[PDB]
RNA sequence: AAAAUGACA
RNA sequence: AGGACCGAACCGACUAAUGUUGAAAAAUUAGCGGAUGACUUGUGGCUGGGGGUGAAAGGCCAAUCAAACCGGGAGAUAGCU
RNA sequence: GCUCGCCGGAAGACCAAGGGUUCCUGUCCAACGUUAAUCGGGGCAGGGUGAGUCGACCCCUAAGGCGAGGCCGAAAGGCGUAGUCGAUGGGAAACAGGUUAAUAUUCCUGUACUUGGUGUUACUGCGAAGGGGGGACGGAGAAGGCUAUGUUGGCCGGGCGACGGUUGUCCCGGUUUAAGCGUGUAGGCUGGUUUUCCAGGCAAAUCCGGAAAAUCAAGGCUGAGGCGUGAUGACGAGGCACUACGGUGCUGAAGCAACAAAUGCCCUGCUUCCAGGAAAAGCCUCUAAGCAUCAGGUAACAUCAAAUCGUACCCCAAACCGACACAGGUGGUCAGGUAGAGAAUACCAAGGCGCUUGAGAGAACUCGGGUGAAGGAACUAGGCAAAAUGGUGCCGUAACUUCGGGAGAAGGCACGCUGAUAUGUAGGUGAGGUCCCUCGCGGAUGGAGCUGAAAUCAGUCGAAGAUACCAGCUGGCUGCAACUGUUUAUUAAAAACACAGCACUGUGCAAACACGAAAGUGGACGUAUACGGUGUGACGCCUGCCCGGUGCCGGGAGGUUAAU
RNA sequence: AAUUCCUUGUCGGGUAAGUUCCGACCUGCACGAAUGGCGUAAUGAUGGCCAGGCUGUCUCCACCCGAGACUCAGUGAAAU
RNA sequence: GGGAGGGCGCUUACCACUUUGUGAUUCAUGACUGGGGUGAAGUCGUAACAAGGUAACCGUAGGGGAACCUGCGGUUGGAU
RNA sequence: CGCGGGGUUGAGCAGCCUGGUAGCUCGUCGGGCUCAUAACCCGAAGAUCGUCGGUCAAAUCCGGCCCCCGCAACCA
């Protein structure tokens, strides 16, 4: 059975990557919420 | 030539092909080809605006010369060719000076005929000259609307336009649709009538024949659910509604023209 | 203008 | 030549049995339909919620769809338990 | 360690995606392992990934994203030009053998190859954001020539049989060699060379393009495979001693021919068809401005540089996606023997495994299977399930029909082995000679050897010769749907949806329609033989009457009627 | 009749017996002409009925080979 | 001593009864149904024979309770 | 067995609509044209409003009785 999560590093960084957040104002308020919360690793970027 | 295929398979019974031996069966002239990318009916927003488009066969657009802005310079037809972008076959034209181009092929043009454009050209099929010089009552095609535009009337396969009257600086044209327009007399019009007249007499025969032309299936309204289409609903084929487009506008009779800017050039509406 | 029909012996 | 025939890979899911605190949050076994096409598959893109897409079932949109998920209005309101 | 059993188009070997030390040694069994464990993909400590040629990086682009100015928009912001990014595509080069516990086209041995800088020499007009060529492209099909590879014969080395024979038409093993360089074949493409002229390729042009004249019947391009060289080299069965008893150390014979043969190569070829089958750069060439000393261009010689990142390990699974060491899911490449049409199926080689609880007994009952007396659907909602047919060749085959079908209709007959025809035929392949040769990888003649169907006659064994796996049940009447297809992932695969066909209706191009407060885009780089909406659903014979109602269209007199 | 309530309408065929099936009648509660009428060769994991072959589906169960169930040693759940 | 040859028997080939599977042709029979014929003062009309009161007829198509009507082309075997 | 429309000279259909007023067509009867029948012309009769009951008065208002014609009898 084909499951929902089929990994792909390239597809992950183009969508939820750091430069994907910074490119849009909504995606820039996303980072500010994480920084205010104090999260260890900001977006996804291993 | 119309050829009806022998029924050797359930799905080839009703196939009627149109075959033309004169068409060149090699490859199109390379320096007159471009890249033609399909869309599937999507626009900037990525949403479908026109339905039933997608799939088919890859095609390559050929730069056809519609303006015909080469006065004098007699030219010879080299070969007839099949154009996937249009409904009428094209013709490769080699001008005397050595330049090659493409034109639409009138029904009376062979491989080796001679054409020439300009205001001094002879009155023969394939010549282009303004309707100021074209004699009244003639049958023409590739009619221009504005001087130098390129041509927008009678460009499909087998159509023609009749020059009815010449009122001063204007010319009245009877079109295929039945309308009678008025155009400026200074517009060009390639003389003759477009070829490939047997284009009607061709039945695709099977679903795949339509599918490999970029025509997706269409679904009737009465099968739809009431959310998806105004017809919708029903316990076993109930209609009880006035026929309408999916967006509520009434079809089957309702006129939908409103221009108020080109009405000055309409003499008698289609009927 | 309308003007149909009449067993056999 | 064939949206031609029989039949493997490949795709799909018509019948029966088992399994129903399963080996498996839809599978195994024995049979079954297509198998040069309107086929099938790898990689990368586009379409965003009263919206997308739909060979049209109200189907699919991350095990969730007659209106997704997350946070906020919000300790919404409950003549009812 | 010796037996046994399983897979063998996989349960073998190599990658990509993905994972991140799981790889290799030493050590430990508290926890993890559905049991114990001395073992592990577990804990601990140490070791291991070596590149001018493999990839990444890099040059160029597709879908597409971002987008200086710009257009539009209450604010955020939307679209888009110049450009710049974006592989799943195009662009230079390395192969054998050896070596580690773990790496190797990376280390060593041998032999090569590509693009740049600088220098010397010899000639020389070089010169671009621009022009031209080329890169550069579909589906089916058909043979022809080869190779991978296999079988057999020859040669070499070894053996003389645990029990009847086995010095022979006897048994076992080996018989390998690359990249590169040279020759250029089977084949496939185009006629070539010279002179003159010009409305084209925005400028220019010696290049493409176009028009003539003369000349010669030839040239040029592409091209698998084969043959030399690399290679008096490496490899090689085995023989020789220590055995750290794991292997290491030493030497090394033959190393050919015939036949069969691909889905692989010539093939980006040829034939044919309609649904008419990417872009740019590298590369070749042409000139502009500019320089005619230069600078730069071509050829040979010498030297230098080729940086940085990945390189272990699993990759159809115990290491990836499924909460698990889960009967599930995952793209590409390789394809041995026998029987077989075959990648099906049966047994095997290389290679890998026996699936992480076992030992007993042989009750009911459940699951998976084998056989059955007589009857043969009597069971039941229903022949559900089981049973049955099943291959090649030949004879033969109805009603109906759109003349294609129905049809594998139905129903039958032959099928092993031996010998002869023929000490193996028909056919295929083709060696010695033999002649000619534009003299070469040449053209006939030539039939040694190798290979090998199919059919008849006679005989023979069995109860049974398509013997095992594999492998149609068949007819008759009828409704719906013309047909091939699609649908409720996860209780409905159908009579439902679609479909080619028909009709109504709108749409004259800045088209109707649709997405958007707008700019703008799809429609379409299409133009009424076109496009959108609606209903019906092949084909045949057809489609009657009603405009009173509700809608649509046309009319413009008269009544009623808004803002101002 | 995919439409017919009365209805298992009536007649005929097939069966020893046929509410289903095929043919006909017309008394169409409440068929009908592109929300198409009537036919139709081929096709169908489509609905209904019939016949040949075949058999554990059945009269009516009997025997046998494996995996569990049962005993021993180890580890060791769940609903309520 | 036996030999040659024959016979009994076994086997092969040809073939008649017989059993299958498909058709072809012909004779009876069949719910219902098309047309034809005869028959009694039946019902509806009056198509034709006179210019039969719209001249008749021929081929074809459409329509209608029935004779028939109309369209299209053709004939005189039509009266004044 | 709940709710409805209707019963009118021989047949079909109005008049019940806010209570006094019974009409149309066909048909029947007697005369008339014709040899005669149809067709046509001229004239007449024909019902007390299904029945049984309840305001000056009832086909009309009301109730029961009789008949016919319709609709609905549903969710499990
Ligand atoms: Mg539906
Ligand atoms: Mg609606
Ligand atoms: Mg209905
Ligand atoms: Mg097929
Ligand atoms: Mg098949
Ligand atoms: Mg879901
Ligand atoms: Mg809502
Ligand atoms: Mg509130
Ligand atoms: Mg609350
Ligand atoms: Mg085996
Ligand atoms: Mg670890
Ligand atoms: Mg343990
Ligand atoms: Mg470890
Ligand atoms: Mg943009
Ligand atoms: Mg800007
Ligand atoms: Mg780039
Ligand atoms: Mg790539
Ligand atoms: Mg390794
Ligand atoms: Mg490795
Ligand atoms: Mg799970
Ligand atoms: Mg396990
Ligand atoms: Mg697994
Ligand atoms: Mg197999
Ligand atoms: Mg047992
Ligand atoms: Mg059995
Ligand atoms: Mg036995
Ligand atoms: Mg039995
Ligand atoms: Mg028996
Ligand atoms: Mg019974
Ligand atoms: Mg029974
Ligand atoms: Mg079976
Ligand atoms: Mg179907
Ligand atoms: Mg199908
Ligand atoms: Mg299903
Ligand atoms: Mg339909
Ligand atoms: Mg109609
Ligand atoms: Mg239909
Ligand atoms: Mg508990
Ligand atoms: Mg008469
Ligand atoms: Mg007459």
CATH of the domain at A6: 1.10.287.3980
How many residues are present in chain A?
A: 46
What range defines the domain where residue B158 resides? 117-194
B106 and B15 within one domain: yes
Write down which residues 231-260 in B have CB closer than 7 A to strand E.
231, 237, 239, 242-247, 249-257, 259
Radius of gyration of chain B (CA): 23
B53 and B26 within one domain: yes
Q: In whole angstroms, what is the distance from residue A45 CA to residue B4 CA? A: 64
Give the nucleotide with minimal C1' distance to the Cα of B176: E528
Q: Which of B194, B209, B244 is the last residue of a domain?
A: B194
In chain B, how many domains are there? 3
Give the nucleotide with minimal C1' distance to the Cα of B236: F35
User: Is residue B120 packed enough to be buried (19+ CB in 10 Å), middle (13-18) or exposed (0-12)?
Assistant: exposed
The torsion angles phi and psi of A15, rounded to 5 degrees, stand at -105, -55
B252 and B167 within one domain: no
Write down which residues 166-195 in B have CB closer than 7 A to strand E.
175-177, 179, 181
What range defines the domain where residue A35 resides? 1-46
Helix (H, G, I), strand (E, B) or coil at B16: strand
- Is residue B212 within 8 A of residue B57, CB to CB? The reply is yes
- β-pair type (B161-167, B139-141): antiparallel
SS (H, E, C) B22-53: CCCCCCCCHHHECCCCCCCCECCCCCECCCCC
Helix (H, G, I), strand (E, B) or coil at B144: coil
Q: In whole angstroms, what is the distance from residue A37 CA to residue A40 CA? A: 9
Kindly give, in sequence order, each residue whose CB lies less than 8 Å from that of residue B197, ignoring residues fewer than 6 positions away: B107, B157, B158
B238 and B189 within one domain: no
B86 and B62 within one domain: yes
């Amino acid at each position: 059975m084909k499951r929902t999560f089929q990994p792909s590093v390239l597809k992950r960084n183009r969508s939820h990557g750091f430069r994907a957040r910074m490119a849009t104002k909504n995606g820039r308020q996303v980072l500010a919420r994480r920084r205010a919360k104090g999260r260890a690793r900001l977006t996804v970027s291993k | 030539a119309v050829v009806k295929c022998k029924p050797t398979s359930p799905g080839r019974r009703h196939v009627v092909k149109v075959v033309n031996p004169e068409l060149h069966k090699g490859k199109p002239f390379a320096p007159l080809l471009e890249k033609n990318s399909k869309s599937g009916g999507r626009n900037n927003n990525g949403r479908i605006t026109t339905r039933h488009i997608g799939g088919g066969h890859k095609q390559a657009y050929r730069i056809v010369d519609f303006k015909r802005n080469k006065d004098g310079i007699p030219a010879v037809v080299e070969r007839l060719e099949y154009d996937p972008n249009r409904s009428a076959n094209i013709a490769l034209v080699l001008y005397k000076d050595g330049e090659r181009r493409y034109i639409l092929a009138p029904k009376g043009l062979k491989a080796g005929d001679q054409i020439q454009s300009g205001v001094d050209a002879a009155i023969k099929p394939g010549n282009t000259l303004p309707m100021r010089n074209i004699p009244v009552g003639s049958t023409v095609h590739n009619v221009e609307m504005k001087p130098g535009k390129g041509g927008q009337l009678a460009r499909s396969a087998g159509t023609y336009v009749q020059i009815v009257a010449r009122d001063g600086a204007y010319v009245t044209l009877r079109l295929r649709s039945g309308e009678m327009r008025k155009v400026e007399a200074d517009c060009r019009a390639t003389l003759g009538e477009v070829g490939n007249a047997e284009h009607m007499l061709r039945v695709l025969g099977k679903a795949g024949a339509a599918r490999w032309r970029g025509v997706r299936p269409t679904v009737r309204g009465t099968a739809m659910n009431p959310v998806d289409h105004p017809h919708g609903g029903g316990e076993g084929r109930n209609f009880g509604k006035h026929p309408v487009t999916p967006w509520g506008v009434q079809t089957k009779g309702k006129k939908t023209r409103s221009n108020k800017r080109t009405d000055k050039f309409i003499v008698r509406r289609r009927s």
